[PDB]
Amino acid sequence: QKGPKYTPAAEKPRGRRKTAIGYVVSDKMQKTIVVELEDRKSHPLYGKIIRTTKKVKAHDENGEAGIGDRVSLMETRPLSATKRWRLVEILEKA
Amino acid sequence: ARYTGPATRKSRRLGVDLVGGDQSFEKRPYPPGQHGRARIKESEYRQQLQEKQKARFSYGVMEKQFRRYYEEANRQPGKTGDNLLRILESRLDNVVYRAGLARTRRMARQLVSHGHFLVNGVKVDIPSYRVSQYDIIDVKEKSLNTLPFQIARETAGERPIPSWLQVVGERQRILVHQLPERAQIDVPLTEQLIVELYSK
Amino acid sequence: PTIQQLVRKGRRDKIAKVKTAALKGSPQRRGVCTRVYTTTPKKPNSALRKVARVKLTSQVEVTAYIPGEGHNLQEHSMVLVRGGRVKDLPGVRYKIIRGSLDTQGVKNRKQARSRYGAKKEK
Amino acid sequence: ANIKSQIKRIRTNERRRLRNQSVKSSLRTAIRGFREAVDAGDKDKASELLHATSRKLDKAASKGVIHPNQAANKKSALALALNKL
Amino acid sequence: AVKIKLTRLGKIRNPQYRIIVADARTRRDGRAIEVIGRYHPKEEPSLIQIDSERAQYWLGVGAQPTEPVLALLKITGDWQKFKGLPGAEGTLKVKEPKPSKLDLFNAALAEAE
RNA sequence: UACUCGAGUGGCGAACGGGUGAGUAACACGUGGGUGAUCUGCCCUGCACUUUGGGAUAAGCCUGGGAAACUGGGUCUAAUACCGAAUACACCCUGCUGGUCGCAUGGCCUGGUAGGGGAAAGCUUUUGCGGUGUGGGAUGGGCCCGCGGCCUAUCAGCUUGUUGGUGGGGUGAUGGCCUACCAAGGCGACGACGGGUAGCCGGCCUGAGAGGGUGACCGGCCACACUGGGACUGAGAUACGGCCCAGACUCC
């Protein structure tokens, strides 16, 4: 009456990473684009909604997205410093 | 602590005679001091303070405790005033006074503090003991034959009994139906000016 | 103002002026009376108000009133300085309190003895 | 020091330090030999030194001088260098 | 080491413990992974409330209890439910509920004759 | 001798617990997430084993040096100390290859296949203790990120490993973390860079509330241990009561 030679691990569901739709504002680095993000939230006190403009740096690996392109990004691990996003697809290339 | 000073003069300062049996105030009407019969500026603060002190010195409660009673009443629901009166009446000195065993809240306080009572079996040396619904307040075995309780059972027809209370035995056991409502309280005082005071 | 004016520039409360800076957050301080003397108050009042220039432990030299009838204070006296405004004396915000290991209580105070360092006599 | 256990642990830690020192130094020597064989261009010598060095890295990881993941990364680098040679 | 412990709570001479599970490297009054019981040994029956299912989980995954809480598990049968020696004892005794104040009130009313 | 045990070897602990808030305006904290980018002693549970051989040394004995701290030598002794080898085919690496998931690198099927490899410790008679590898779990962490919480522009330009990439190195792990080369970018009025202040939070005080102020006890996280720097050991180190160096101070 032996137990299993091998016990499988559990089927831990894969975590959901963050997804960001943005606009490119630089492509002058190799395999790296900079992207603007528009996050709108209410002021903590006055209640007005503040359109905040945030920059992030992402990875494309092929150099197809240029300035003015609406894109979609998925968070990743550090691929460099300052760089925790991967490109997914381009949406409104211009 | 407690106020072990003269009793009539507080009632005189506050108009209402809480106990009675003097002639100075009762012939000449005035608060104590040489400056009785003086001119008064009729301030709402004096009105309010006077009701607060009426309560304090009718019972044997000091301000740092009356403040806590007020705060309990204000937190817990209903009208803060009648909740406060319910609290001040739901304490051991007052229930035995209202039951007539002492005919003075000072005497009731001395009795409870000296331990001539107990509640549901356990001795109580706390006049501030907040009694509750369905509380048997027994007297101990020395105390029932002592002179003050002899006087109680002898003269237990002078002042009435509240409804929420009743004495049940010749041994002067006391029972609590519920806690009193503002009709059950029967005290010569309002209760709104005090909460106004502590809301200032 | 407008809400955007507020989210940009915001509200800034008027800066409360630090007071009794010579104490440096303390309720009291110890100091040597560098010069005990007397000052003349403002115009409506007239009196010979007793004061001392005291060099505190905060490395600050300030003027300090000496309440009460009498005072035994000379220079080089260790004194305990509290706060308290004396209106008629313009340039002073500190007082001296008895029971300072030099400033004994006032003589024959019998009403407000606690404010003048006087022991009960019985 | 001023405690018996630390006074002893000083000696023990120095002992373990000397051990791990000898082991890691042997490893780095094996790797420099392998990398010399590779940058020179020899292949079968490089494969033999690779087997020997991988063996020693597994051995050190089992002794606890290094982590098995570290041994893995080292020998993987060696194998890939040999392959791309 | 994960361990079942007694966190002291309560005032000075009233050691009301709370039966937790926590690492051994924590401190007594520290952060607890989970609370599974309570232990008030000032009652004469010295209350032993517990949560059996979570106790069994933590024992199955290998939480070494302390000695007192081991005795408590032996009392509640969870130790025995875990190992399986006498099945599950169930040695626990509780404080009998004293009579209701309403019942005392009505009894004294009846005596008021 | 072997109950008992100084000292000693060895194991485990010593990284917890306890203290302070100097530093820190930062992923330090709080909160929420990610880790297909990761470690995890002890503990629990499965699988497979625990084979074989050897060389020393502390201690002890004989000495030497030194004022002391301490230390050199010779000789001698054992082990769960140390070291080789065998086996492991669960594990590690590489090559080829299939399916599947896909959130892209890639992950899962202990995929398959070929090659080359990886270990162990014995003790005691008693409610017996252990050891190794491996799978899983639990716990404890690490790293990354969103958002949030001070003053200051009478501090406007800052950055050159700085932004990115390739190949290597390094790590437990991703990554300029490090390096050679390459490209010249990256951050800034939404306040960069500076200056000042300050441990953060749950909470506490006030207040009708919003808010303001605060961060004492208690509890959590961080940081630090004479100052500064550094690593070693180890599962794990800011290593308070550990090591090395330098410095100040105190003492022989």
Swiss-Prot record, chain A:
Sequence position, cross-link Isoglutamyl lysine isopeptide (Lys-Gln) (interchain with Q-Cter in protein Pup): K93
Gene3D superfamilies, sorted: Nucleic acid-binding proteins
Keyword Ubl conjugation part of the UniProt annotation: yes
Keywords, ordered alphabetically: Isopeptide bond, Ribonucleoprotein, Ribosomal protein, RNA-binding, rRNA-binding, Ubl conjugation
Biological process terms in GO annotation: translation
GO molecular function: rRNA binding; structural constituent of ribosome
GO cellular component: cytosolic small ribosomal subunit
One Pfam family here: Ribosomal_S17
Transmembrane segments: none
Annotated stretches, region: Disordered: 1-18
InterPro entries: NA-bd_OB-fold (IPR012340), Ribosomal_uS17 (IPR000266), Ribosomal_uS17_bact/chlr (IPR019984), Ribosomal_uS17_CS (IPR019979)
Family statement: Belongs to the universal ribosomal protein uS17 family.
SUBUNIT field: Part of the 30S ribosomal subunit.
Function, in words: One of the primary rRNA binding proteins, it binds specifically to the 5'-end of 16S ribosomal RNA.
This protein's name: Small ribosomal subunit protein uS17
Origin organism lineage: Bacteria, Bacillati, Actinomycetota, Actinomycetes, Mycobacteriales
Swiss-Prot record, chain C:
GO molecular function: rRNA binding; structural constituent of ribosome; tRNA binding
Gene Ontology biological process terms from the UniProt entry: translation
Quaternary structure and partners: Part of the 30S ribosomal subunit. Contacts proteins S8 and S17. May interact with IF1 in the 30S initiation complex.
Keyword set, alphabetical order: Methylation, Ribonucleoprotein, Ribosomal protein, RNA-binding, rRNA-binding, tRNA-binding
Protein's UniProt keywords contain Ribonucleoprotein: yes
Name under which the protein is recorded: Small ribosomal subunit protein uS12
Keyword Iron: no
A family per Pfam: Ribosom_S12_S23
Family the UniProt entry places it in: Belongs to the universal ribosomal protein uS12 family.
UniProtKB/Swiss-Prot annotation, chain D:
Keyword tags: Ribonucleoprotein, Ribosomal protein, RNA-binding, rRNA-binding
GO biological process, one term: translation
Region: Disordered, residue numbers: 1-21
GO molecular-function terms, A-Z: small ribosomal subunit rRNA binding; structural constituent of ribosome
Pfam families, alphabetized: Ribosomal_S20p
UniProt cross-references to InterPro entries, sorted A to Z: Ribosomal_bS20 (IPR002583), Ribosomal_bS20_sf (IPR036510)
Domain of life per record: Bacteria
GO cellular-component term (any): cytosol
Gene3D superfamilies: Ribosomal protein S20
Chain intervals with Basic residues compositional bias: 6-19
UniProt cross-references to PANTHER family, sorted A to Z: 30S RIBOSOMAL PROTEIN S20 (PTHR33398), SMALL RIBOSOMAL SUBUNIT PROTEIN BS20C (PTHR33398:SF1)
General function of this protein: Binds directly to 16S ribosomal RNA.
UniProt-listed HAMAP family: Ribosomal_bS20
Family of this protein: Belongs to the bacterial ribosomal protein bS20 family.
The protein's name: Small ribosomal subunit protein bS20
Taxonomic source organism: Mycolicibacterium smegmatis (strain ATCC 700084 / mc(2)155) (Mycobacterium smegmatis)
Gene that specifies this protein: rpsT
Curated annotation (Swiss-Prot), chain E:
Superkingdom of source: Bacteria
Keyword Ribosomal protein: yes
Keywords of the record: Ribonucleoprotein, Ribosomal protein
Entry's Gene Ontology molecular function annotations: structural constituent of ribosome
KW Ribosomal protein (keyword) present: yes
Chain coiled-coil ranges: none
GO annotations of cellular component type: cytoplasm; small ribosomal subunit
GO biological process annotation, one example: translation
Family note: Belongs to the bacterial ribosomal protein bS16 family.
Name assigned to this protein: Small ribosomal subunit protein bS16
Species, as recorded: Mycolicibacterium smegmatis (strain ATCC 700084 / mc(2)155) (Mycobacterium smegmatis)
Taxonomic classification: Bacteria, Bacillati, Actinomycetota, Actinomycetes, Mycobacteriales
Residues represented out of the complete protein: 2 to 114 of 156
